[PDB]
Symmetry: C2
Subunit: 171 residues, 2 copies
């Protein structure tokens, strides 16, 4: 191994410590990362985290005292639950530094996207960065004994600025 | 009281008795149903129910001991969480008999779909039936104090046949 080396720094950035680091490793393992022979890649956990985040965001929007009407609920959800915004948040919280892959093509797309985001429509969005925003939510869920509340404790702080920005002026 | 007349039979069909029948009424109230001026229409409950069902079905699929691959999980979820399957289940459980709306076109589309399902690509699927499969889940969630487990106690029995069938194919 060197597989889990360095993960403590990520845990500090999102403020969550894994009990079973295998979940965190799985979350960050791309299908091309053949050097990880101890867990699967992140796809199963992405499948799970995807629905988890959809539910948590939906619930938050539904409960917001601003009492959005249905068309607005729908627009807000569309704008907060999509691969592009999930990627932008992943790179904002350094997920790309712990991602594991073997892909010069991913490197290129991620690198351009990360640069472009820091200076902030035809920039290519790296879908994998959105996918690990989802997979990590799944990992946290699984690590905490299937606790939605733990996931939201971690994820709400990262999403709150866009939630507030969009809920004041809906795209 | 005019508005909730006969809802006790629906409650028996799905095996859930509402603590506050307002949520049941709201779940079945289409935006066109101008006679109801005591609750909102179903759309806010549909918004919530939609994500609730996607979570519960995703979770079920992920936990299945066959350890479906990602590709399979994704295909099963698409086959199980779509407006058409939801509309077919709503109708199978008589949701259409309690739907409140003012729209001949909608009821015509529902009638034809209900018939087509009894006779069982061409047929028009009434989106509103899928929408109220979602809204009722949202309603049960609210009525039960935002309990995901109560929703699934009601909804799993309705979905199990299709979950088991698609999961074997
Ligand atoms: Mg989703
Ligand atoms: Mg994804
Ligand atoms: Mg949905
Ligand atoms: Mg719907």
């Amino acid at each position: 191994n060197h597989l889990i080396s360095g993960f403590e720094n990520f845990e500090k950035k999102i403020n969550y410590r894994f009990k079973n680091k295998a979940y965190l490793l799985q979350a960050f393992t791309h299908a091309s990362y053949h050097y990880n022979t101890i867990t699967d890649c992140y796809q199963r956990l992405e499948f799970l985290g995807d629905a988890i985040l959809d539910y948590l965001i939906t619930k938050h929007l539904y409960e917001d005292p601003r009492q959005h009407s249905p068309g607005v609920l729908t627009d807000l959800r569309s704008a907060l639950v999509n691969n592009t915004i999930f990627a932008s948040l992943a790179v904002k919280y350094d997920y790309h530094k712990y991602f594991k892959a073997v892909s010069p093509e991913l490197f290129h797309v991620i690198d351009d996207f990360v640069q472009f985001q820091l200076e902030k429509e035809d920039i290519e969005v790296p879908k994998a960065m959105g996918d690990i925003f989802e997979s990590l939510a799944g990992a946290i869920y699984m690590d905490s004994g299937m606790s939605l509340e733990t996931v939201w404790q971690v994820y709400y702080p990262m999403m709150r600025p866009l939630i507030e920005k969009f809920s004041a002026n809906v795209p």
